[PDB]
């Protein structure tokens, strides 16, 4: 790892390198760092598809909570990644962090109205 606490597959997922994350998977699927961030969280933050659905199929937690209580669905709704939103949605919406906002609320503040319609129905 590293002094702060993180694994290389986290960097690979955040940077969107498919071959590296695939070859490393062939480590922990739900490895959580000192931030509590998951590789699924970083993939949703970067919005880079194939690692998201691979990790979801690899056994990544659907409702993993970081230090801030944000799900990968929360990050995908926040950063405008609607595709990640539905990809996680068919993996199984009312989850709240300490502040207590659903991804609908995150879409509301960020103006991601496209994600907003998907979340309500």
């Amino acid at each position: 790892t590293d002094e702060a606490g993180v694994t290389p597959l986290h960097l690979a997922a955040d940077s969107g390198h498919l071959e590296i994350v695939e070859v490393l998977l062939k480590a922990d699927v739900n490895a959580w760092d000192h931030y509590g961030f998951t590789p699924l969280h970083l993939a949703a933050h970067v919005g880079h598809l194939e690692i998201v659905e691979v990790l979801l199929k690899a056994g990544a937690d659907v409702n993993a909570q970081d230090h801030a209580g944000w799900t990968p669905l929360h990050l995908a709704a926040l950063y405008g990644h609607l595709e990640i939103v539905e990809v996680l949605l068919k993996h199984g919406v009312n989850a709240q962090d300490m502040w207590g906002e659903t991804p609908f609320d995150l879409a509301i503040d960020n103006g991601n109205e496209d994600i907003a319609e998907v979340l309500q129905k």
Partner: peptide
């Protein structure tokens, strides 16, 4: 600045 910390923080 992706070599240090997550690339997402740098790309924000």
């Amino acid at each position: 600045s992706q070599l240090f910390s997550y690339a997402a923080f740098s790309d924000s």
